[PDB]
């Protein structure tokens, strides 16, 4: 005796877009070889729900068991605020153990999105910086990407969300381009996907004129 639960939210990105499948994960340790089976059982706000997939069970280095099982929640469902209830039921367990996660509670706050061109000592170079600047969001889960002509640009670098001192998020996005395309007057844009702005999508434009 005996084994613990662990549950875990979805990742932002597969919140935020449409074409992915946002997942809560209910994690099971200390499984022993001796009662190795793990009954899930799923809740959505109460409501038992029967689409759960488990995956086969992993021998741990310290000689038991980790056993998996994966809800795909609903986009609409989890920005809702609905509660996801995890409860696992083993031989070991003289009662199950239950675990219960839903998307963070606060009041959504929109984020601010501010374009930064490359400096006169970073603009002289062969590759340069184009910033942008997120600011004062609220909850943390958020997906930047970088674009230009429809195109995606893959060279950028995204700090991960800061909390700030009235409670909000800040983060940075950094895409780097060769200094000839941002001479040459190439739009590039920056995307943000997040559950307060207008259509859960923003993008701020950046140009030399
Ligand atoms: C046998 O060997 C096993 C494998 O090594 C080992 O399992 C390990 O067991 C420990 C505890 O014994 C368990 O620790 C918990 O880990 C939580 C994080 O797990 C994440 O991230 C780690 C690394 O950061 C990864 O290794 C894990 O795989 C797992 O990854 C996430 O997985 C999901 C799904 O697969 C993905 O979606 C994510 O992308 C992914 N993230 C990453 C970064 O990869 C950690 O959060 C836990 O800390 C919290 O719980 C503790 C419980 O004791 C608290 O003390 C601690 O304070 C934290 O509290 C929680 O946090 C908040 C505070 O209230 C609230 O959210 C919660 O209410 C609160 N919970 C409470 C109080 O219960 C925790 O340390 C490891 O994850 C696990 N590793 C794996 C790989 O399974 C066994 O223990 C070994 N057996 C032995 C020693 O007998
Ligand atoms: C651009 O900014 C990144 C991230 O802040 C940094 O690592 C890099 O050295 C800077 N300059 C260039 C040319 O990328």
Not at 47 to 68: F, G, I, L
Request: hydrophobic share 30%; charged share 20%; glycine share 4%.
């Amino acid at each position: 005796g005996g084994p613990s639960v662990f549950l875990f939210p979805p990742k932002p990105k597969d919140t935020l877009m449409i074409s992915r499948t946002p997942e809560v994960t209910c994690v099971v340790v200390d499984v022993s070889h001796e009662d190795p089976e793990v009954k899930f059982n799923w809740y959505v706000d109460g409501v038992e729900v029967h689409n759960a997939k488990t995956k086969p069970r992993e021998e741990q280095y310290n000689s038991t068991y980790r056993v998996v099982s994966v809800l795909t929640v609903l986009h609409q469902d989890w920005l809702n605020g609905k509660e996801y209830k995890c409860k696992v039921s083993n031989k070991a367990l003289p009662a199950p153990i239950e675990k219960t996660i839903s998307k963070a509670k606060g009041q959504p706050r929109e984020p601010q999105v501010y374009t930064l061109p490359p400096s006169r000592e970073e603009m002289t170079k062969n590759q340069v910086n184009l910033t942008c600047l997120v600011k004062g969001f609220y909850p943390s889960d958020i997906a930047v990407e970088w674009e230009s002509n429809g195109q995606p640009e893959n060279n950028y670098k995204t700090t991960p969300p800061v909390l700030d001192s009235d409670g909000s998020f800040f983060l940075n996005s950094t895409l780097t381009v060769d200094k000839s395309r941002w001479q040459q007057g190439n739009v590039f844009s920056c995307s943000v996907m997040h559950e307060a702005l207008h259509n859960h999508y923003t993008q701020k434009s950046l140009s030399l004129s």
